[PDB]
Design a protein around this ligand. Structure first.
Ligand SMILES: C=CC1=C(C)/C(=C\c2[nH]c(/C=C3N=C(/C=C4\NC(=O)C(C)=C4C=C)C(C)=C\3CCC(=O)O)c(CCC(=O)O)c2C)NC1=O
Ligand SMILES: *[C@@H]1O[C@H](CO)[C@@H](O[C@@H]2O[C@H](CO)[C@@H](O[C@@H]3O[C@H](CO)[C@@H](O)[C@H](O)[C@@H]3O)[C@H](O)[C@H]2NC(C)=O)[C@H](O)[C@H]1NC(C)=O
Ligand SMILES: *[C@@H]1O[C@H](CO)[C@@H](O[C@@H]2O[C@H](CO)[C@@H](O)[C@H](O)[C@H]2NC(C)=O)[C@H](O)[C@H]1NC(C)=O
Ligand SMILES: *[C@@H]1O[C@H](CO)[C@@H](O)[C@H](O)[C@H]1NC(C)=O
Ligand SMILES: *[C@@H]1O[C@H](CO)[C@@H](O)[C@H](O)[C@H]1NC(C)=O
Ligand SMILES: *[C@@H]1O[C@H](CO)[C@@H](O)[C@H](O)[C@H]1NC(C)=O
Lengths: 49, 244, 49
């Protein structure tokens, strides 16, 4: 919620989630772990510096 | 996307200052109202403030001096342009404006309006090129990779210059909120060489989901299009102001 | 203009009677008559003071 994907406080909409163990159990999925400051709502950071 | 171009004839920008009269108001919401008087807080350009002016033309000494510095984009920008030959095609939005961060380009190819977001390698001088009167090449960047957004709207515009007096004034307002870039537009045809005083209100035009950190922009002057193999520029003026 | 709508069945326009109505999810009760008002091209309803 701080470095990857942030929703605005006045959100209107639905959220769905489901398990995908049998199709997505592989290498190649990453998330950002270090960053200077938080991102703003509906923003993306694709840098790899 | 073709790439590269170099200009030595350049000179220092002058950075004039001009009065803003009562321009730079826009429709701030999507609620229809009828015969009502309202009090609204927001971000607007104050009446009577100074704003900055830049120009572009060949003066006389076998040399052309443009004016494309890098400007801050804090809380929003008011843009104006006086032109007569389809000069100012687009802008560049971003943070470092190099190949280490994502950037957004809004331009015109005299056939479509293009909006793209990618890891751009910007050139030293972005501009298009016409073949006297034929869209020739475009030298705005040489390489673009790892790229997120692409969209185009067909809009064919005339590429035959009519130099002389100023025939068009175009005004824009740029805002950024919650990953959305908001563009408001207004246009008119006048016959004068300054900005007339008055009160103009700008209509909404575009709401784009870019999702990119914006703190700085610069202007693309694709003016050089009217020659053969040598490529030089006609005249144009533009104005910049901020929001409070 | 509505771009995504739910699966509902439409009925006939009944005029000059006190009825319940549902126009694109806008619900109410009253009497429906012809109009001489003018709208903007992308406007769907009008509201008074
Ligand atoms: C990038 C394109 C761009 C355009 C066209 C724009 C919007 C825009 N420019 C218009 C007029 C215009 N004014 C311009 C000039 C421009 N061409 C440019 O590259 C720039 C910056 C402008 C700014 C307006 C053009 C091309 C027209 C004529 C459009 C037509 O033929 O209808 C109009 C009214 C006519 C129409 O709906 O087409 C719109 C909506 N804002 C932009 O930034
Ligand atoms: C921009 O695009 C390029 C090309 O798609 C991306 O390059 C790829 O980056 C990944 C790492 O994010 C590389 O994976 C690594 O490869 C090395 C061996 O080369 C390996 O030792 C590491 O363990 C890891 O597997 C991948 O090879 C690389 N591919 C290419 C063709 O360059 C780049 O990441 C993109 N940048 C972004 C994030 O926008
Ligand atoms: C900046 O522009 C505004 C708008 O034209 C000028 O305001 C006018 O000033 C004159 C002289 O005081 C008044 O008679 C008008 O009634 C004013 N009109 C409006 C709408 O404000 C203002 O004077 C200009 N300022 C400068 C320094 O040029
Ligand atoms: C506007 O410009 C004038 C002249 O440079 C300057 O004196 C004034 O402080 C500036 N600010 C206003 C009033 O917009
Ligand atoms: C990025 O730009 C720098 C400076 O021009 C250059 O040295 C480097 O090779 C470029 N790298 C890419 C991503 O093309
Ligand atoms: C401009 O249009 C031409 C012809 O369709 C196309 O070849 C070219 O890639 C376009 N350039 C830009 C900058 O969009």
């Amino acid at each position: 919620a701080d470095y990857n994907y942030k929703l605005p406080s006045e959100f209107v909409g639905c959220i769905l989630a489901w398990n995908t163990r049998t199709i997505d159990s592989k290498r190649g999925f990453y998330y950002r772990l270090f960053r200077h400051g938080n991102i703003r709502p509906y923003e993306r950071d694709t840098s790899n510096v | 996307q073709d790439g590269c171009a170099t200009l030595s004839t350049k000179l220092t920008p002058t950075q004039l200052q001009v009065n803003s009269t009562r321009r730079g108001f826009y429709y701030f919401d999507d609620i229809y109202r009828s015969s009502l008087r309202v009090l609204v807080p927001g971000y607007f350009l104050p009446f009577g403030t100074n704003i900055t002016r830049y120009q572009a033309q060949v003066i006389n000494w076998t040399a052309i001096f443009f004016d494309n510095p890098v400007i801050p984009f804090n809380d929003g920008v008011y843009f104006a342009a006086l032109e007569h030959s389809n000069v100012v095609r687009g802008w560049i939005f971003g943070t470092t404006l190099d190949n280490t961060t994502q950037s957004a380009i809004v331009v015109n190819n005299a056939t479509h309006i293009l909006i793209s977001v990618c890891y751009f390698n910007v050139c030293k001088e972005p501009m298009f090129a016409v073949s006297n009167f034929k869209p020739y090449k475009s030298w705005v960047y040489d390489r673009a990779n790892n790229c997120t957004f692409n969209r185009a709207y067909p809009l064919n515009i005339s590429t035959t210059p009519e130099p002389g007096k100023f025939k068009a004034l175009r005004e824009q307002v740029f805002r950024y909120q919650d990953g959305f870039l908001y563009i408001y537009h207004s246009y008119e045809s006048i016959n004068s060489d300054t900005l007339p005083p008055g009160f103009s209100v700008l209509k909404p035009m575009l709401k784009l989901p870019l999702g990119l950190n914006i703190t700085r922009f610069r202007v693309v002057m694709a003016m050089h299009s009217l020659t053969t193999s040598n490529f030089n520029t006609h005249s144009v003026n533009y104005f910049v102001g901020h929001l409070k | 203009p509505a771009t995504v709508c739910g699966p509902k069945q439409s009925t006939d326009l009944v005029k000059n009677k006190c009825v319940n109505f549902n126009f694109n999810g806008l619900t109410g009760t009253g009497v429906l008559t012809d109009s001489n008002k003018k709208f903007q091209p992308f406007q769907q309803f009008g509201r008074d003071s």
